Design an enzyme around this catalytic site. Sequence first.
Site, PDB file in Angstrom:
ATOM      1  N   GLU A  51       0.852  -1.163   0.000  1.00  0.00           N
ATOM      2  CA  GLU A  51       0.000   0.000   0.000  1.00  0.00           C
ATOM      3  C   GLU A  51       0.906   1.237   0.000  1.00  0.00           C
ATOM      4  O   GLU A  51       1.961   1.229   0.643  1.00  0.00           O
ATOM      5  CB  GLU A  51      -0.926  -0.049   1.218  1.00  0.00           C
ATOM      6  CG  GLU A  51      -1.955   1.071   1.280  1.00  0.00           C
ATOM      7  CD  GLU A  51      -2.971   1.059   0.157  1.00  0.00           C
ATOM      8  OE1 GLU A  51      -2.768   1.830  -0.793  1.00  0.00           O
ATOM      9  OE2 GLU A  51      -3.973   0.303   0.240  1.00  0.00           O
ATOM     10  N   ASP A  65      -2.089  -5.029   1.291  1.00  0.00           N
ATOM     11  CA  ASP A  65      -1.499  -3.865   1.925  1.00  0.00           C
ATOM     12  C   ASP A  65      -0.032  -4.132   2.292  1.00  0.00           C
ATOM     13  O   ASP A  65       0.775  -3.253   2.125  1.00  0.00           O
ATOM     14  CB  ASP A  65      -2.322  -3.465   3.140  1.00  0.00           C
ATOM     15  CG  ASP A  65      -3.635  -2.793   2.771  1.00  0.00           C
ATOM     16  OD1 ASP A  65      -3.618  -1.905   1.897  1.00  0.00           O
ATOM     17  OD2 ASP A  65      -4.658  -3.152   3.367  1.00  0.00           O
ATOM     18  N   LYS A 106     -14.665  -7.693   3.828  1.00  0.00           N
ATOM     19  CA  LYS A 106     -13.340  -7.922   3.293  1.00  0.00           C
ATOM     20  C   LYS A 106     -13.160  -9.391   2.934  1.00  0.00           C
ATOM     21  O   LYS A 106     -12.627  -9.702   1.889  1.00  0.00           O
ATOM     22  CB  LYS A 106     -12.244  -7.588   4.310  1.00  0.00           C
ATOM     23  CG  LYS A 106     -11.942  -6.105   4.454  1.00  0.00           C
ATOM     24  CD  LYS A 106     -11.169  -5.540   3.298  1.00  0.00           C
ATOM     25  CE  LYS A 106     -10.585  -4.184   3.603  1.00  0.00           C
ATOM     26  NZ  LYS A 106     -10.006  -3.588   2.382  1.00  0.00           N
TER      27      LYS A 106
HETATM   28  C1  LIG Z   1     -11.268   0.792  -0.154  1.00  0.00           C
HETATM   29  C2  LIG Z   1     -10.007   0.205   0.237  1.00  0.00           C
HETATM   30  C3  LIG Z   1      -9.788  -0.233   1.552  1.00  0.00           C
HETATM   31  C4  LIG Z   1      -8.561  -0.784   1.940  1.00  0.00           C
HETATM   32  O1  LIG Z   1      -8.447  -1.140   3.136  1.00  0.00           O
HETATM   33  C5  LIG Z   1      -7.532  -0.922   0.968  1.00  0.00           C
HETATM   34  O2  LIG Z   1      -6.339  -1.437   1.329  1.00  0.00           O
HETATM   35  C6  LIG Z   1      -7.716  -0.506  -0.359  1.00  0.00           C
HETATM   36  C7  LIG Z   1      -6.795  -0.529  -1.421  1.00  0.00           C
HETATM   37  O3  LIG Z   1      -7.177   0.092  -2.430  1.00  0.00           O
HETATM   38  O4  LIG Z   1      -5.646  -1.098  -1.437  1.00  0.00           O
HETATM   39  N1  LIG Z   1      -8.963   0.060  -0.705  1.00  0.00           N
HETATM   40 MN   LIG Z   2      -6.485  -2.111   3.294  1.00  0.00          MN
HETATM   41 MN   LIG Z   3      -4.694  -1.580   0.146  1.00  0.00          MN
END
Ligand SMILES: Cc1cc(=O)c(O)c(C(=O)O)[nH]1
Ligand SMILES: [Mn+2]
Ligand SMILES: [Mn+2]
Length: 179
Positions: free
Chosen positions: A61, A89, A115
């Site tokens: 991320e 991430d 998730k």
């Molecule tokens: C909406 C959302 C929540 C997350 O926790 C995340 O890692 C992402 C990501 O784009 O990597 N996107």
């Molecule tokens: Mn995330």
């Molecule tokens: Mn993410």
Amino acid sequence: MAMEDFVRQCFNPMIVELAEKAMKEYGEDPKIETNKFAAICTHLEVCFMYSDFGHRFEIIEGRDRIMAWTVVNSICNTTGVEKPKFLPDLYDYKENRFIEIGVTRREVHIYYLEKANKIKSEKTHIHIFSFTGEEMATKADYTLDEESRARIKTRLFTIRQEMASRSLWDSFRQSERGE
Ligand SMILES: Cc1cc(=O)c(O)c(C(=O)O)[nH]1
Ligand SMILES: [Mn+2]
Ligand SMILES: [Mn+2]
């Protein structure tokens, strides 16, 4: 907007820059989607804090998609680990699994489900945090020691209470933008 000011004053400039960049590439105005902005920064900071608490973690991320996928592909080639469809991430070199980090204003079990259902058929470890100091993680494996977890939770609670000082928390909690 107080919210825009809050963000600039409670997150370090690399985080803000990264959040702004991401928003503006996908046509989003941080001065308009101020709750989204706050959420992106918040989640970025958690990701950074999580990696800092261990070279245990690779940060995925916060990079552009080319670099993110380069890192993921590289980890996969050298470990054998299956490739995720979504960019996670972090990667954990100790447990040898990707991690998806969730930060939510709702109940942790609720967001956890969202998730787990979004990336079902992945073997990505999931770790959810709230602004109330609750967390939920795949198989109640929380990955970090108590101190690291506690530091994240304090930071999250502190954001919440800062927002509340500034009469911003009610907007933020009733929004889901950024989740
Ligand atoms: C909406 C959302 C929540 C997350 O926790 C995340 O890692 C992402 C990501 O784009 O990597 N996107
Ligand atoms: Mn995330
Ligand atoms: Mn993410």
